[model samples]
Target: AECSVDIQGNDQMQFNTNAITVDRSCKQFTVNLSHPGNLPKNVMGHNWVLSTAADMQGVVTDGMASGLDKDYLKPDDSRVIAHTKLIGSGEKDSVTFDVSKLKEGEQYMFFCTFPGHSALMKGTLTLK
Candidate 1:
């Protein structure tokens, strides 16, 4: 289904893709995350966080305070729409969310909130 997609992160601080499309026919959407680098988790860890484009900066700011043990995400943070856990080289994680959560014509973003990773590990998500 057009409801799911696969993505990857590398040691170079970048994601494999910069855009995602979710078909309106799907009731839910999923993102599969993987790391293909050789670095350890703490050094080059990555995670997938979803939210409105406007909320991206704030979420990343708050997440940094949450520390690494929480996967670089704030605990019980409502602003976060959905997220996959932090992963390291050769590791993988996935997250799923109800398609209804997205609004038409709205701008959504997905990123890795591992400290400074968001600057280079982010992408756009849109519903079609």
Candidate 2:
């Protein structure tokens, strides 16, 4: 088994899954995001963003103003634990984060930072 996962992004603003678990034994975990729909980045782009559950809303709100060049995310935002670049149909990106960053009891969340997509594109993350 690998310490990585491939996540699919579709035109409906949804991720293929709603939760992810990482093996604590792995020093790092990777997430690969792919956009497979016919939509363009301007309208239906997607990206993978990870942060504490409490910071999800804040990250989403801050990212909207950063525009596409930054993958719709704030440049160097401290709350971002890990993230993949924005992608359109046929494009993909991956992100790897140190597994140690996750705590045993803290809540974590992963979502798309494509403007208004988070409402339907968010998921839970946990370390096991």
Candidate 3:
């Protein structure tokens, strides 16, 4: 089996799946995000960002200023573990990161940083 997953975002600002599982045997893991809504990126763009649960708020707070051109993320922010490009309706993006980047018991979060979407677009990720 592969250590990868596909997640979808809609105009409702919600993710189809909430939690993700990472296999311990995989050296690297992938996350693919797709937007199937009929909205444009400026209004309903979405991306997958991974970071420690503790760092999620700080990352989202700082990312607001980065704007859409940078996928609403700080340029080269070290706190980010992995992230996919911002996408809109009918668009898709994926990101891959080394499994070693995550700790066994640490809490990890995956979220979309499109303005105020984090309130509902966030979810937990765990290593198995």
Candidate 4:
């Protein structure tokens, strides 16, 4: 079976889906992120980053130091379960992660790491 999700990020810090559902039966889960904005990446870029709800702040804080080159995500961050590459106007990136990496009954969230974007660029991701 195929397990996948599609999300869109526009100029505003908002995601198309506030909550996404993934089937637990799938061996792998794919998340595709797309930016349909016309703004430059430096001015307004977006990415999908997944982590425990409690670690959101820390992740974003640490990710900023990683810079735009690394998609504003910390290298090999254990807290990050999955993430997409930074994308800007008309750009897209996809990330597939082993479903086994996610624990049952645990809460997770996805957000954009772009500076000041997370204020509205966040969503919930749950497995069913």
lDDT of each candidate versus the true structure: 0.93, 0.92, 0.93, 0.89
Error of 3 at 21 (Å): 0.5
For model 3 the local lDDT of residue 1 reads 48
Candidate 4 off by > 4 Å = none
Clashes of 2: 0
Q: Which of the two candidates, 2 or 4, achieves a greater lDDT against the reference?
A: 2
Give the C-alpha lDDT of model 4: 0.89
**Error in Å for residue 18 of model 4:** 1.0
Sorted by TM-score (best first), the order is 3, 1, 2, 4
After superposition of all CA atoms, the RMSD between model 1 and the true structure is 0.8
Clashing pairs in model 3, backbone N/Cα/C closer than 3 A: none
All predictions: root-mean-square deviation over Cα?
A: 0.8, 1.0, 0.8, 1.2
Residue-wise C-alpha lDDT for candidate 4, range 1-128, written one tens digit per residue: 55998999998777899888888899999998898879878879999999988898999998988898888988999999989988898989999999888888888999999888887899888888
Model 1 misplacement above 4 A: none
Taking all chains together, each candidate's TM-score versus the true structure is 0.97, 0.96, 0.97, 0.94
Model 2 Cα lDDT, one tens digit per residue, 1-128 = 35889999999889999999898899999998899889999899999999999999999999998998888999999999999889999999989989999989999999998988999999999887
**lDDT tens readout by residue for model 3, 1-128:** 47999999999999998899998899999998899879999899998999999999988998888999998999999999999999999999989999999987799999998899999999999998
Model 3 residue 93 distance off true place after TM-score fit, in angstroms: 0.7
lDDT of 1 by residue, 1-128 (tens): 67899999999999999999999899999999999979988999999999999999999999999999998998998889999999999999989999999998889999999999999889999988
Model 4: lowest-lDDT 10 consecutive positions: 12-21
